[PDB]
Amino acid sequence: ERPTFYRQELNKTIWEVPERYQNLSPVGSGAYGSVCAAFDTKTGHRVAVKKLSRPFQSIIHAKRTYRELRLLKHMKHENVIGLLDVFTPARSLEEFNDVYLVTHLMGADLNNIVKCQKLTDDHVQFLIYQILRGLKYIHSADIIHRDLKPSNLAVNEDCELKILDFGLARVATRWYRAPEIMLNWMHYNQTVDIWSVGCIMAELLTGRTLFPGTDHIDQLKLILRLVGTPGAELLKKISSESARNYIQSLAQMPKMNFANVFIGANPLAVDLLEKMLVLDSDKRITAAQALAHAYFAQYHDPDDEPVADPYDQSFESRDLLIDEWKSLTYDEVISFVPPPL
Ligand SMILES: Cc1ccc(C(=O)N[C@@H](CCC2CCCCC2)C(N)=O)cc1NC(=O)c1cnn(-c2ccccc2C)c1
Q1: Where is the active site?
Q2: Is 36 near ligand 1, meaning CB less than 6 Å away?
């Protein structure tokens, strides 16, 4: 019918959950939002429970709440975070004011893993393979992550990887961002995420941030030093006059030979980096193409790299009232079907 809930105070936060979830312990020191590790008495498994912060306080909060629930309810893939449960203590739409989301509990984020040292080439093959397998899935539904960086990627002891998003909650996004979506200078596609994967892979191999810019101007200067200033062919496709003026006003840099930058790395790794870190977003490798690159010979299976069901994002166009976004969210909580045990 409906379970029995119990109340708690944790880090100045109130928490009201079903008895099924036990021994709630705050994790991530703010960086994941309001999240507790919990023990799930139904499965005998550890889980993560997130309490959304002020979910219906404004129109923009209410839309963000709907968007996060809709994305989580869609994701059914080994390398993307998925929804085990969603609950509110509210018995009706009228008193609906709190949303709790339940996922798998992961062992570590990749930020607090590179921080020690660099990884073996074999560890890098396996981790980048799993990122690209999750991205083929997300991109097949016309979903773009847009903020891939080591702090949004999580792994277990056995090195199984999942893509998450910790949104706004306290490693600069700037350092991993595609030049075209940073300065909005060209048509942008799913391959903004492939630029980010290139930056992350470089960092796992060298143990150093590839492009540690201090701001957007410093960031572009560090990038152009490796990949070279745009040619006349890429200049032809820049719609922004101010962008085009800025670029053409710098003194010309050549493309460096990546074999001279990533010295001693697997030459198959250097070749894949050349294909990911191209300025022209029409010429960057896709996730599906990257999975068939020789670098992943050990892992690639074309019969086990699935696509996603279609995702209706027509809501993204709509301008509705708080109470409308709230009712739509309540509907999705009510209609939720747990994954098969
Ligand atoms: C409970 C929960 C709820 C929401 C999210 C989450 O990723 N939400 C996304 C969903 C959509 C996004 C679209 C692009 C593809 C990726 C997904 C968002 N911002 O909308 C994560 C967890 N879980 C965690 O925060 C979590 C799970 N173990 N840990 C953890 C716990 C201890 C140590 C290390 C880690 C990583 C943290």
Answers
A1: 165 (proton acceptor)
A2: no
Method: X-ray
Ligand 1 atom index nearest CA of 49: 1
CATH for 182 = 1.10.510.10
Give resolution, Å, one decimal: 2.0
Q: What is the 3-state secondary structure (H, E, C) of the chain?
A: CCCCEEEEEECCEEEEEECCEEEEEECCCCECECEEEEEECCCCEEEEEEECCCCCCCHHHHHHHHHHHHHHHHCCCCCECCCCEEECCCCCCCCCCCCEEEEECCCEECHHHHCCCCCCHHHHHHHHHHHHHHHHHHHHCCCCCCCCCHHHEEECCCCCEEECCCCCCCCCHHHHCCHHHHCCCCCCCCCHHHHHHHHHHHHHHHCCCCCCCCCHHHHHHHHHHHHCCCCHHHHCCCCCHHHHHHHHHCCCCCCCCHHHCCCCCCHHHHHHHHHHCCCCCCCCCCHHHHHCCHHHCCCCCCCCCCCCCCCCCHHHHCCCCHHHHHHHHHHHHHCCCCCCC
Would you say the CB of residue 48 lies under 6 angstroms from ligand 1?
A: yes
The answer, yes or no, to whether any atom of ligand 1 lies below 6 A from the CB of 106, is: yes
Please indicate if the annotation marks 100 as binding a ligand.
no
Give yes or no: 312 in active site: no
